[PDB]
Amino acid sequence: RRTKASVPAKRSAFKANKFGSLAPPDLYPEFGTYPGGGESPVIPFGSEKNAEREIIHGRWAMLGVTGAWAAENGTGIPWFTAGTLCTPDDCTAVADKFPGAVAPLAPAGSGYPNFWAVLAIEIFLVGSAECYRTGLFENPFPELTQGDVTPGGRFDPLGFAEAGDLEELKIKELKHSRLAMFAWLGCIMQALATQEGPIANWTAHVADPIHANVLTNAAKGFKFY
Amino acid sequence: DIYPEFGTYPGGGESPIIPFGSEKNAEREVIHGRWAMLGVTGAWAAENGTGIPWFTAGTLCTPDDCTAVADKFPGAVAPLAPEGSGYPSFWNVLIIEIVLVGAAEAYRTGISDSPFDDGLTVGDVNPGGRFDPLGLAESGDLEELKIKELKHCRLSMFAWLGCIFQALATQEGPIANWQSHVADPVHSNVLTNAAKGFGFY
Amino acid sequence: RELWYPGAVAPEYLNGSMAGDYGFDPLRLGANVETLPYLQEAELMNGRWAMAATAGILFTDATGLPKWWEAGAADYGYDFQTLVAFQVVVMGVLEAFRVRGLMKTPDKRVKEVKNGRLAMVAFLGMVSSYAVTGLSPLEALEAHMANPQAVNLFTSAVGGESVAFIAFLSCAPTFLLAQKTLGDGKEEFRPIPW
Amino acid sequence: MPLSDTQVFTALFVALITGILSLRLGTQLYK
Amino acid sequence: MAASLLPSIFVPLVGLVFPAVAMASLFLYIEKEQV
Ligand code: CLA
Numbered sequence: 001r002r003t004k005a006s007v008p009a010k011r012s013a014f015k016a017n018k019f020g021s022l023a024p025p026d027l028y029p030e031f032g033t034y035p036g037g038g039e040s041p042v043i044p045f046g047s048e049k050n051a052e053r054e055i056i057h058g059r060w061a062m063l064g065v066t067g068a069w070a071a072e073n074g075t076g077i078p079w080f081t082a083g084t085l086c087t088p089d090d091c092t093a094v095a096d097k098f099p100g101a102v103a104p105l106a107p108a109g110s111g112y113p114n115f116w117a118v119l120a121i122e123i124f125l126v127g128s129a130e131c132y133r134t135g136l137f138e139n140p141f142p143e144l145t146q147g148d149v150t151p152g153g154r155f156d157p158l159g160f161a162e163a164g165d166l167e168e169l170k171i172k173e174l175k176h177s178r179l180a181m182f183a184w185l186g187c188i189m190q191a192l193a194t195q196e197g198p199i200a201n202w203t204a205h206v207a208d209p210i211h212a213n214v215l216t217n218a219a220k221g222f223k224f225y
Numbered sequence: 226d227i228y229p230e231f232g233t234y235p236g237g238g239e240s241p242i243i244p245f246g247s248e249k250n251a252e253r254e255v256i257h258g259r260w261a262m263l264g265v266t267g268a269w270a271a272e273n274g275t276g277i278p279w280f281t282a283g284t285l286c287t288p289d290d291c292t293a294v295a296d297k298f299p300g301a302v303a304p305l306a307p308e309g310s311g312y313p314s315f316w317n318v319l320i321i322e323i324v325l326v327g328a329a330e331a332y333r334t335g336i337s338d339s340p341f342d343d344g345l346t347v348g349d350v351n352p353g354g355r356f357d358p359l360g361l362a363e364s365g366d367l368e369e370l371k372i373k374e375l376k377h378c379r380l381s382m383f384a385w386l387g388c389i390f391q392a393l394a395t396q397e398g399p400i401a402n403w404q405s406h407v408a409d410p411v412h413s414n415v416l417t418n419a420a421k422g423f424g425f426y
Numbered sequence: 427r428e429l430w431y432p433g434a435v436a437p438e439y440l441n442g443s444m445a446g447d448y449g450f451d452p453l454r455l456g457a458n459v460e461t462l463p464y465l466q467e468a469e470l471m472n473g474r475w476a477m478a479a480t481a482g483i484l485f486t487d488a489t490g491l492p493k494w495w496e497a498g499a500a501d502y503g504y505d506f507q508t509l510v511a512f513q514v515v516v517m518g519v520l521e522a523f524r525v526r527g528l529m530k531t532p533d534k535r536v537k538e539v540k541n542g543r544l545a546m547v548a549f550l551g552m553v554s555s556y557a558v559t560g561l562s563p564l565e566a567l568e569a570h571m572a573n574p575q576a577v578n579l580f581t582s583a584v585g586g587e588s589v590a591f592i593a594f595l596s597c598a599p600t601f602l603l604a605q606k607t608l609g610d611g612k613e614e615f616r617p618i619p620w
Numbered sequence: 621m622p623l624s625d626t627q628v629f630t631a632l633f634v635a636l637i638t639g640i641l642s643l644r645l646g647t648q649l650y651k
Numbered sequence: 652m653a654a655s656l657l658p659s660i661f662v663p664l665v666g667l668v669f670p671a672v673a674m675a676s677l678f679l680y681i682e683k684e685q686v
Pocket residue numbers: 631632635657658659661662665
């Protein structure tokens with residue numbers, strides 16, 4: 001073994017070309033304001049960390065809302081009962097839940113996602129990433145900063161951040177984040193009140209808009225009065 | 226490090242989630258912990274001794290009937306009450322409760338003058354002047370003991386919040402839930418109860 | 427200071443610094459300097475567990491509770507698997523804390539040492555007496571006190587073994603005295619080299 | 621009649637002492 | 652009891668344990684530098 005240290009000179013498989021900002025110069029005409037650009041309309045700004053906490057809950061709630069949406073669209077199972085499928089016992093069922101899946105997580109027969117297997121992989125993968133994101137563990141990518149919700153190095157392979165206007169993209173993500181978190185809260189409250197999935201509640205509300213509302217179900221007590 | 230867990234003692238730290246705000250907030254915290262600690266250990270002891278869950282213990286003592294409390298106490302030589310007479314009554318205890326706790330409260334907080342009038346200052350959670358006859362405040366590392374008490378305070382309050390939410394969900398009791406979980410942890414959990422429903426789903 | 431027999435020679439690494447040091451280490455287990463604190467702490471732990479065990483055996487025996495060897499089979503609230511899981515978790519946590527404290531780091535110390543030493547001997551005695559006679563410690567003591575002359579270890583099933591061992595103990599220091607006065611005491615080897 | 625267990629273990633302990641003495645002799649020879 | 656126990660212990664003791672310790676010990680001594 002000798003030291004080569006040649007020039008890689010590799011380019012991204014996709015590298016978004018400069019597209020700039022696709023938003024008006026005004027960036028938060030909506031209620032409230034992005035952090036670091038004005039005063040919080042109602043709730044007090046708890047801490048500098050709260051902005052990054054908002055971003056993380058936002059991205060997680062985006063992913064959760066889209067997961068509940070796609071799971072109910074593809075299987076019809078509500079998200080709040082999808083946990084009962086994969087359990088220490090009979091986690092075989094959870095396998096075939098993806099429409100068009102060429103193959104099952106559980107091949108026919110014994111072959112299957114075990115709860116503990118899935119769980120052990122889940123801890124070892126997600127916790128590792130969670131730690132690497134925060135100050136726990138260490139930084140495997142020194143070029144990026146732990147504790148920054150917008151690293152933008154290897155984590156933007158397409159380079160949309162640099163291709164456009166960075167801060168308008170940031171606020172766009174923030175607005176999507178807040179929208180999805182509020183939608184997630186609506187989904188949990190709907191699950192509590194109606195015991196039916198989000199897309200089921202949507203379908204009931206669009207089939208007969210005038211009925212199948214909060215107040216319609218309240219007339220029946222949300223199945224509790 | 227004295228406090229290696231997530232948060233830190235008030236004397237030094239930032240209070241990451243909720244801002245520190247007033248120091249009266251820290252006074253309340255300690256008092257809430259000193260109380261909830263007694264509450265959690267009392268619910269523990271009541272469940273172990275009598276099998277009665279804490280959250281319905283008040284049903285036991287009522288204006289018409291407050292005699293059942295006498296036979297509950299385990300290992301007592303004579304009852305609580307005059308046997309059949311059962312002098313202890315809900316109101317009999319209530320007048321005693323309100324007067325004794327009100328005196329203890331007011332002499333704590335200084336609404337009324339301190340009867341002890343021994344240089345003790347009201348509005349301090351740790352007097353250390355008279356409420357430590359054993360001298361463990363005087364001896365040892367007193368600050369380290371404040372830390373331990375705090376830690377026990379916060380743990381006990383979190384356990385209390387768990388106990389009330391388990392009473393609401395499981396409807397069984399804290400120690401009964403503990404025994405169910407220990408007998409079978411895999412198929413007796415919050416998520417197993419959610420799968421079965423909490424009695425409402 | 428008094429050693430483990432009148433006329434003994436304490437090993438050079440046993441200079442009385444440690445609590446309970448009677449210059450007894452014929453096999454040179456504590457000869458290595460770096461493992462000697464570990465062996466001290468192993469002594470203290472085995473002594474402490476033997477002390478707790480002696481208390482929990484004698485009180486159990488004298489209060490009419492099930493015999494110490496039978497106490498496992500008694501019907502308890504928690505089955506074997508959950509109990510061993512509890513034990514594994516809590517003792518692992520406590521021993522982790524003890525290890526880290528050890529890594530960080532007179533009269534009463536010596537007292538504890540001697541007490542633990544007696545306990546370990548007494549516990550070994552209880553196990554051996556049960557294994558030979560089948561009698562619990564207080565029953566064994568009552569049997570001995572009933573007929574002290576003929577009811578003893580040296581008249582039990584392992585009696586000749588014990589008599590031979592006591593003969594070896596009684597005749598060891600005399601041979602060590604010959605070894606000192608005739609030999610040079612310049613051994614380059616130790617009974618446990620590590 | 622087989623040998624009693626006490627007989628076997630007494631002879632084995634005597635052997636252990638003999639082995640100790642053999643080690644003493646070997647060490648003395650090695651000097 | 653001796654007959655049912657002692658062979659099963661001492662045959663591995665003399666044919667696996669004692670050989671291992673003896674060979675290791677002798678190795679450590681023979682390769683031990685003079686100083
Ligand atoms: C030199 C004599 C000699 C020989 C060749 C043997 C041979 C054997 N014995 Mg026996 N034995 C002897 C003496 C001897 N013994 C003596 C004096 C005693 C004490 C009373 C015993 C007690 C004894 C028991 C209790 C058992 C054996 C067993 C065994 C068998 C193999 C396991 C073993 O080696 O453990 C031997 C165990 C020892 C504790 C070591 C005893 C050896 C003597 C005391 C020292 C001999 C050393 C030798 C002269 C010099 C060695 C240096 C160098 C040449 C290697 C084997 C048939 C076992 C058996 O039957 O397995 C099927 C078994 O259970 N032996």
